[PDB]
């Protein structure tokens, strides 16, 4: 039922506004230990010999690297994505240039995606960046992904009950609730807001009085858009392990300036990054994946805020390997 | 000065402290020792509000705000401008409220009536202490308390609720709200009933206790009765805060997640998961 | 263009704000605060001597009279002329306007301070169909004590001093509300009966405790005119007597607790 | 202490009173029975109940509304009876999600909601007639029914009048435990923070005021129960020491006082004004105000605060930023 004291608290607004984080130390510690499993950087190797574009046969992305650099990259990739399966998860034992296993081609696209994240989306990931580990956490299937309908459990490493399974229709409301922090909001914010750029998140008018021509009948956005935005915000909050006041002064949710924290602006860029990743990198992979990875509408698994963050405001508490692996970005 | 029936009741005695020294009226107001302490604390509190407000940006009464300190000052004293005024004003408020309560005790004893009114008035004092003293003690800073301003205190209530994602799902809040609503309904029913009996209209005759009970037996199959609706009314009203206080105290010290998630105790029982 | 906009920075909601305040203050000041003045007004000063014309404020603060048509005949009009006739056994402790009065005699018998009664009708309160409302069980033979509760008939009445003061002979019941309001008791060693309101009675299984008065003080409890019925004024007299005890039963009760 | 103010020490039993009304004396059904434990804190008698046409009509229309809701709730869990009990709080019947305007929505998206709305409204109206007419029948004023009328009016404001005035059924209150709650936040968000709606303020002021008054009034009557203060009708028509003491308690405390009758007018008015104020706020919302916070800013009322963490410009309005 309850969580024993003390609580850790922070301040995110002017004194007396009750803005800030509220954290249970035991929960923070458990997430710290889970995220501390991030393998250390492999020892640096000296750049020696010709570029692997001249040495190897089928290197399209990492061709600028030397042999020792490149094999270091491949050892790191293995540790991050497929430590239990090994090099043979993506490779034929007898022909390392063969693309015959699907994880090879997917991994190539993931290399491009990861490079794009660290080069084009610095507005969100800053100097911290992402590696393969940020999402994958040492398994080929990342633990936190989304289909075009909600699924339980959130962590796909846990085994679903009969009701949790997506085909059991009686469990739909619970599947949806647990994606919106246990609210009864009847909207799936992933498919509405994060799968593509079709919907506007903002719903609050920016005028005191209702403007003539947008304020009556079918001219109006239905109230459902406000429920859906709220549902997105519940989901976002839970995915970062925080609350609304981390980003907003609830006096005016719609206002920027002093009414928002810098974290709100970073989150804004995050919505755009996730849309780019889903539309242009992750959703097209349904062609290259087996049918047992696809969802019930032939969709590839896609990313939300949780995919990287996993209940923490900075993924892996701000741990970085950017300097240790220049080949993952930023690229000049 | 005096109501037509008043003089016979205006006798000496009933005080808790000081005997005859403060046992007198000024206009309609009984004074007593706690009349004197109340005025002291009021004057001091209103002075501190005036002085603090003048050092602030504005004089618009809707926008004035005396705020507690930053969280970093913990349970210590803070510099006057940055939380100390709030601290002093808070002490004066408690002085004034408790004085006001104890004065009502003295007035009750003089009239030979029950102490039920001051008793009832302890409830909102208690709730003020929950918000400003007890909950801030449990979290380790005065900075978690509410600011003194007409509109600013609503911004605090607002953000405090959204700190727990959806405060409507707080079970102590659900109880509190339910008692707020049923109390307001019940006051309307009771007020309406009494007026309906004494004022049937059109020169018709004043009805009776039996009519009162007949009306509610007819409409809902039960009438609690004349004395008991007064007991119930006090119970309903008092429980707005008595139950509410648990939902307030729980948020932060005994629960750090969103309030909807709390209902996992029900939803996630393995039997039906 | 804007829904709700009017000329010169005005809008509809801004006007309704002013109107709402006007409604509230009108109802509060002109209606409710005058309804509040239907008892005890006009106020009494150190001698309101101007017998030939009324002060303007005293007329303005009163509502128009209303007349209640009573259920068993008669009418009552409020507000009305009701000065308190009876001589009060009280003396001014000082010359100041708001100084307390002191009892000159025995305040319980003299009926001053918390011993005071209101000047209600010397009329028996009635049921919906004309019968006396408050009557002892000897008369209300179709009423009974509920199965489970103490029957106090037979039990002794112990006063504040711990002395047995009498024996409970009957309960008086409200026939309109089905609720006991008084116990009747014989005052031991005085050859008389006395009523006590239940609110002054701690009902135990073997005794009735009464902390409001001493045993000796049961002698001077206001007597009723009739044995088997009570008037509204007598109800006030009886109830007030015990209440007076809370402040006056001993000298120490009027003094400070600290 | 007066133990009578806590509970009835000795309960009384006697023949059941029946006050005759101008009609319907035969429509009183059931035989009265008595509860000893209820009788500790109340009147022991339960029943009979009056069972007229308006009451039966109310039960009929209400049950129909309840059944429409429960069926749609059950459909939401594909009729699994166990998941129905589990998820009950989270289930609901929703107004249209799509913008049809005032158009009658399809049954799958809000038509069932509209139906349940109709039958509840007819149920409230039928009960209102019961509340009014029973008063007339027993020769009582209609004060309760006018207070109740304001409560029904408020329901109609949030249920259909506000939707009509802006022209979208999508803005109605869903049926369900958590879903009717969720509406409150969606509505407050849509209209720019309800804390900044003055009529929200007024309603709250009166609602808190009802708390204050019933606590103070209840306590007052209990404090003068020794002198028969509970017998309020005859204390009005013939002032007793109960109400003299009560009046002087308040006069000496706060400088002024009510009468035993007028305090009931105060309470009745406060209760009424919770609902009247709420209704005025909803009628103005969407119709004449779109963002209550910005409206308060326009009229110079909103508080402002320094930045704590840095002020953060809207990224959408930076040059070269994406959509
Ligand atoms: C987004 C934010 C939310 C929120 C956040 C919230 C919080 C954080 C808290 C509440 C609480 C409460 N909320 Mg609430 N809330 C409520 C109702 C309530 C109250 C019943 C309850 C108690 C308030 C209180 O502590 O008063 C306090 C009043 C006091 C202390 C009065 C003190 C009086 C003092 C002794 C005397 C003062 C004297 C004057 C200075 C003298 C001057 C007089 C002049 C005239 C001379 C309703 C009916 C709704 C609706 C309709 O949606 C709602 C929505 C929300 N609440 C939002 C979802 N609410 C409280 C609660 O109990 O929660 C469980 C609480 O802590
Ligand atoms: C847990 C949540 C809380 C809460 C949530 C809340 C909400 C959501 C809303 C209010 C509103 C109000 N609150 Mg508030 N509140 C207030 C006072 C107020 C008033 C400004 C206003 C109307 C209240 C009312 O009529 O009550 C019933 C009492 C009545 C009718 C008697 C008359 C009281 C009188 C109007 C109070 C005036 C107070 C003075 C302006 C302050 C004292 C000044 C000094 C210098 C003498 C006090 C004095 C306190 C204290 C001491 O604890 C308090 C605590 C709380 N409020 C908690 C922090 N309050 C409403 C408002 O309109 O805000 C602007 C409103 O919408
Ligand atoms: C984030 C969301 C917010 C919110 C959103 C909100 C909205 C959207 C509305 C309110 C409204 C109100 N809010 Mg509020 N609110 C309130 C208090 C209040 C109420 C006094 C007031 C009136 C509602 C009412 O009494 O309904 C209870 C009474 C009702 C519903 C009447 C029902 C009577 C009916 C005849 C009963 C019949 C039932 C049948 C027997 C059953 C049949 C059903 C079957 C057939 C299915 C407090 C004290 C607080 C605090 C402390 O923070 C708060 C915060 C918030 N509110 C947040 C700012 N609030 C209302 C208002 O005043 O707006 C201006 C309103 O419309
Ligand atoms: C400030 C003003 C307040 C206010 C005022 C007033 N509110 C009144 C009156 C006034 C004046 C009455 O005259 C009337 C009444 O009659 O009172 C005894 C009534 C009502 N306010 C109810 C509910 C409510 N008020 C709420 C709010 C506010 N109200 C606001 C706060 C809320 C909230 C908070 O959401 C709720 C849920 C119902 C009990 C009732 C309507 C029944 C109905 O419309 O039937 C509709 C038909 C049905 C079939 C529903 C059946 C179930 C209900 C519980 C009825 C069952 C009764 C039946 C007799 C049970 C059998 C018992 C027997 C076997 C022993
Ligand atoms: C469930 C229980 C209910 C309840 C019960 C009862 N309520 C009672 C009694 C009972 C029984 C009385 O016996 C007593 C009284 O006499 O009645 C006329 C009283 C009273 N209820 C008042 C206010 C009230 N009740 C509220 C709530 C409930 N009441 C709940 C609902 C609320 C809100 C907010 O809801 C308000 C505002 C005063 C009018 C009065 C105290 C006067 C005082 O104490 O004088 C002494 C103090 C002063 C005159 C001023 C002090 C100024 C200080 C020093 C400086 C200001 C500091 C302040 C903290 C700044 C805040 C700013 C603000 C914008 C945030
Ligand atoms: C200058 C100086 C040295 C003075 C010394 C003396 C001294 C201590 C003075 C105090 C001065 C101060 C601080 C005065 C302020 C007084 C205050 C707090 C006033 C607040 C008034 C408010 C807003 C009350 C809200 C409640 C309200 C709406 C009440 C209206 C209705 C009334 C009057 C209810 C009280 C009341 C109730 C509740 C009954 O049940 C009852 C039953 C039968 C008869 C009468 C009554 C009755 O009067
Ligand atoms: C999927 C997550 C992979 C794992 C695990 C390993 N490799 Fe890999 N490798 C992968 C890709 C997509 C590519 C193409 C890279 C590009 O820039 O286009 C490669 C490439 C190689 C090569 C070069 C082969 C050639 O073209 O001749 C070598 C020598 C190689 N990989 C070796 C290697 C080893 C030793 C691994 C385990 C420690 C390993 N790889 C893992 C994808 C994946
Ligand atoms: C989140 C932004 C991710 C980052 C960074 C990387 N990957 Fe990824 N990957 C992600 C998703 C959502 C998916 C789809 C789920 C799936 O299992 O297909 C994938 C998929 C892969 C795969 C295929 C795994 C399989 O289906 O068996 C591989 C081989 C893979 N990803 C590798 C990979 C590498 C090498 C990365 C770093 C350069 C990398 N991914 C980053 C999400 C994210
Ligand atoms: C940071 C990680 C955030 C948290 C936590 C919450 N919100 Fe938020 N919100 C955030 C952003 C970046 C945006 C803008 C989205 C865009 O694409 O422009 C929003 C938006 C809102 C809105 C709509 C505001 C408008 O202009 O209409 C609302 C009403 C809102 N947010 C509310 C809200 C609530 C209630 C939250 C806690 C449950 C919450 N947000 C969290 C960033 C972040
Ligand atoms: C991996 C590709 C990510 C996805 C998907 C999302 N975020 Fe993220 N975020 C990521 C990184 C690497 C960082 C940097 C951490 C650092 O040390 O700087 C962030 C940062 C944030 C922040 C700022 C947190 C802070 O300053 O304390 C916020 C508020 C945030 N991210 C929110 C957010 C949201 C709402 C997302 C879904 C739209 C989201 N992020 C996705 C990595 C990734
Ligand atoms: C012309 C025609 C076609 C259009 C107009 C029709 C019309 C007038 C529609 C009006 C609709 C209105 C006023 C809708 C209002 C809806 C509102 C305010 C709903 C509010 C709350 C709903 C709740 C709490 C629903 C709860 C539902 C359940 C618990 C399931 C039902 C079962 C029950 C036992 C009910 C118990 C409710 C409670 C006593 C605990
Ligand atoms: C809008 C409400 C419509 C409900 C119609 C059904 C109620 C019937 C009313 C009968 C009233 C009879 N009467 C006046 C003698 O009580
Ligand atoms: C609870 C919300 C209370 C908000 C009160 C704000 C009302 C502003 C009305 C201002 C009146 C017009 N004018 C000209 C003075 O600005
Ligand atoms: C926000 C709700 C406002 C409610 C206002 C009601 C306050 C009662 C005013 C009592 C005034 C007393 N007196 C003697 C000056 O009339
Ligand atoms: Fe009453």
């Amino acid at each position: 039922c309850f969580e024993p004291p003390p609580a850790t608290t922070t301040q995110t607004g002017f004194r007396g506004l009750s803005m800030g984080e509220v954290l249970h130390p035991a929960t923070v510690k458990a997430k710290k230990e889970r995220d501390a499993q991030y393998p250390p950087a492999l020892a640096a190797v000296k750049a020696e010999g010709p570029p692997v574009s001249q040495v190897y046969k089928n290197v399209k992305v990492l061709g600028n690297l030397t042999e020792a650099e490149f094999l270091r990259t491949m050892t790191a990739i293995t540790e991050w994505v497929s430590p239990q399966e090994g090099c043979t998860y993506c490779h034929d034992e007898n022909n390392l240039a063969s693309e015959a296993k699907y994880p090879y081609v997917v991994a190539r696209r993931m290399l491009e995606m990861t490079r794009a994240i660290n080069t084009n989306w610095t507005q969100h990931v800053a100097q911290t960046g992402v590696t393969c580990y940020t999402c994958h956490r040492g398994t080929p299937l990342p633990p936190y992904v989304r289909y075009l309908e909600p699924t339980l459990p959130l962590n796909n490493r846990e085994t679903p009950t009969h009701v949790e399974r997506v085909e059991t229709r009686s469990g739909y409301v619970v599947r949806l609730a647990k994606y919106t922090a246990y609210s009864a909001l009847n909207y799936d914010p992933f498919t509405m807001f994060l799968a593509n750029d079709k919907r506007q998140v903002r719903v609050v008018p920016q005028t005191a009085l209702p403007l003539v021509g947008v304020s009556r009948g079918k001219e109006r956005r239905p109230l459902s858009d406000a429920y859906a935005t709220f549902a997105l915000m519940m989901s976002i909050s839970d995915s970062l392990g925080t609350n609304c006041t981390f980003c907003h002064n609830a006096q005016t949710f719609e206002s920027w300036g002093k009414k928002s924290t810098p974290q709100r602006a970073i989150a804004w860029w995050g919505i755009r990054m996730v849309r780019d990743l889903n539309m242009n990198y992750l959703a097209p992979l349904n062609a290259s994946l087996p049918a047992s990875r696809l969802g019930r509408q032939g969709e590839a698994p896609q990313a939300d805020c949780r995919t990287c963050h996993q209940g923490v405001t900075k993924p892996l508490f701000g741990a970085s390997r950017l300097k240790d692996y220049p080949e993952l970005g930023p690229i000049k | 000065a005096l109501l037509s029936f008043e003089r016979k009741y205006r006798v000496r005695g009933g005080t808790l402290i000081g005997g005859d020294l403060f046992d007198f009226w000024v206009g309609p107001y009984f004074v007593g020792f706690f009349g004197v302490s109340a005025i002291f604390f009021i004057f001091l509190g209103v002075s501190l509000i005036g002085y603090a407000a003048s050092q602030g940006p504005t004089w618009d009464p809707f926008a004035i705000s005396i705020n507690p300190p930053d969280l970093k000052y913990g349970l210590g004293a803070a510099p006057l401008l940055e939380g100390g005024f709030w601290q002093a004003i808070t002490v004066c408020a408690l002085g004034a409220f408790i004085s006001w309560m104890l004065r009502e005790v003295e007035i009750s004893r003089k009239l030979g009536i029950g102490w039920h009114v001051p008793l009832a008035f302890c409830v909102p004092i208690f709730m003020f202490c929950v918000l400003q003293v007890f909950r801030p003690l449990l979290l380790g800073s005065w900075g978690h308390a509410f600011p003194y301003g007409i509109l600013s205190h609503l911004d605090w209530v607002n953000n405090f609720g959204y700190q727990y994602l959806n405060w409507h799902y707080n079970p102590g809040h659900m109880s509190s709200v339910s008692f707020l609503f049923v109390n307001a309904m019940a006051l309307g029913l009771h007020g309406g009933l009494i007026l309906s009996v004494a004022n049937p209209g059109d020169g018709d005759k004043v009805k009776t206790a039996e009519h009162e009970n007949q009306y509610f037996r007819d409409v809902v199959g039960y009438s609690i009765g004349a004395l008991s609706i007064h007991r119930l009314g006090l119970f309903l009203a008092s429980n707005i805060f008595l139950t509410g206080a648990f939902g307030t105290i729980a948020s932060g010290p005994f629960w750090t997640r969103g309030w909807p998630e709390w209902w996992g105790w029900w939803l996630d029982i393995p039997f039906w998961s | 263009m804007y829904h709700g906009a009017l000329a010169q920075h005005l809008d509809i909601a801004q006007l309704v704000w002013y109107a709402q305040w006007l409604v509230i203050w009108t109802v509060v000041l002109l209606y409710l605060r005058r309804e509040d003045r239907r008892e005890g007004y006009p106020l009494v000063e150190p001698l309101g001597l101007v017998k030939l014309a009324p002060e303007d404020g005293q007329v303005y603060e009163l509502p128009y009279p209303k007349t209640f048509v009573l259920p068993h005949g008669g009418t009552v009009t409020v507000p009305r002329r009701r000065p308190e006739t009876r001589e009060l056994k009280l003396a001014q402790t000082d010359g100041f306007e708001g100084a307390p009065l002191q009892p000159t005699g025995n305040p319980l018998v003299d009926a001053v301070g918390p011993a005071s009664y209101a000047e209600r009708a010397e009329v028996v309160d009635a049921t919906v169909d004309g019968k006396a409302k408050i009557v002892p069980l000897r008369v209300a033979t179709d009423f009974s004590i509920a199965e489970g509760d103490v029957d106090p008939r037979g039990l002794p009445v112990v006063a504040a001093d711990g002395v047995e003061a009498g024996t409970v002979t009957d309960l008086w019941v409200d026939r309109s509300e089905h609720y006991f309001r008084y116990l009747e008791l014989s005052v031991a060693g005085s050859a008389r009966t006395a009523l006590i309101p239940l609110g002054f009675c701690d009902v135990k299984k073997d005794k009735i405790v009464v902390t409001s008065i001493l045993s000796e003080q049961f002698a001077n409890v206001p007597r009723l005119q009739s044995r088997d019925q009570i008037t509204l004024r007598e109800e006030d007299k009886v109830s007030a007597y015990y209440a007076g005890g809370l402040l006056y039963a001993t000298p120490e009760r009027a003094e400070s607790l600290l | 202490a007066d133990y009578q103010t806590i509970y009835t020490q000795i309960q009384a039993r006697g023949p059941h009173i029946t006050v005759s009304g101008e009609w319907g004396d035969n429509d009183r059904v059931g035989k009265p029975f008595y509860s000893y434990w209820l009788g500790k804190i109340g009147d022991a008698q339960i029943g009979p109940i009056y069972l007229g046409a308006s009451g039966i009509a109310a039960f009929a229309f209400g049950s129909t509304a309840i059944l429409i809701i429960l069926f749609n709730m059950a459909a939401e869990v594909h009729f699994d009876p166990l998941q129905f009990f589990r998820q009950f709080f989270w289930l609901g019947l929703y107004p249209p999600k799509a913008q049809y305007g005032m158009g009658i929505p399809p049954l799958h998206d809000g038509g069932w909601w509209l139906m349940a709305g109709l039958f509840m409204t007819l149920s409230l109206g039928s009960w209102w007639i019961r509340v009014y007419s029973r008063a007339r029948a027993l020769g009582l004023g209609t004060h309760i029914a006018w207070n109740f009328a304001a409560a029904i009016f408020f329901v109609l404001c949030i249920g259909c009048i506000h939707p009509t005035l802006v022209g979208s059924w999508s803005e109605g209150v869903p049926f369900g435990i958590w879903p009717h709650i969720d509406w409150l936040t969606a509505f407050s968000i849509r209209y720019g923070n309800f804390y900044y709606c003055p009529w929200h303020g007024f309603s709250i002021g009166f609602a808190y005021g009802c708390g204050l008054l019933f606590a103070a009034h209840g306590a007052t009557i209990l404090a003068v129960a020794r002198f028969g203060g509970d017998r309020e009708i005859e204390q009005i028509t013939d002032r007793g020491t109960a109400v003299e003491r009560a009046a002087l308690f308040w006069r000496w405390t706060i400088g002024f006082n009510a009468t035993i009758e007028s305090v009931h007018r105060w309470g009745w008015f406060f209760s009424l004004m919770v609902m009247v104020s709420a209704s005025v706020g909803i009628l103005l919302t969407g119709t004449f105000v779109d963002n209550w916070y910005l409206w308060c800013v326009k009229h110079g009322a909103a508080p402002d605060y320094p930045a704590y963490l840095p002020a953060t410009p809207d990224p959408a309005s930076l040059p070269g930023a994406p959509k």
Side-chain angles (χ1 to χ4, degrees), chain B residues 41-42 45 49 89 92-93 96-97 100 104 117 120-121 124 128 146 148-150 153 237-238 241, chain D residues 208 211-212 215-216 250 254:
Chain B
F41 286 121
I42 291 160
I49 289 161
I89 292 159
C92 293
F97 304 155
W100 198 258
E104 290 181 344
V117 173
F121 182 49
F128 177 84
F146 74 79
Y148 304 132
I150 302 309
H153 87 291
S238 295
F241 292 177
Chain D
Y208 286 173
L212 192 166
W250 289 108
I254 63 168

Side-chain angles (χ1 to χ4, degrees), chain A residues 250 253, chain B residues 93 97 121-131 135 146 154 156-162 165-181 240-241 243-249 251, chain D residues 181 184-185 195 200 204 207-208:
Chain A
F253 286 121
Chain B
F97 304 155
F121 182 49
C122 290
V123 176
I125 294 171
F126 170 71
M127 189 64 175
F128 177 84
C129 294
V130 168
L131 297 159
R135 173 163 186 283
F146 74 79
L154 310 188
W156 176 90
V157 172
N158 190 16
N159 282 303
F160 179 8
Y162 282 110
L165 308 195
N166 193 333
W167 189 265
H168 283 123
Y169 293 63
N170 177 334
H173 191 254
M174 293 157 58
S175 173
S176 188
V177 167
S178 298
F179 281 111
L180 180 79
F181 290 167
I240 299 162
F241 292 177
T243 65
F246 290 95
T248 308
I249 270 285
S251 307
Chain D
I181 288 308
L184 298 164
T185 297
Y195 288 117
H200 198 242
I204 291 167
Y208 286 173

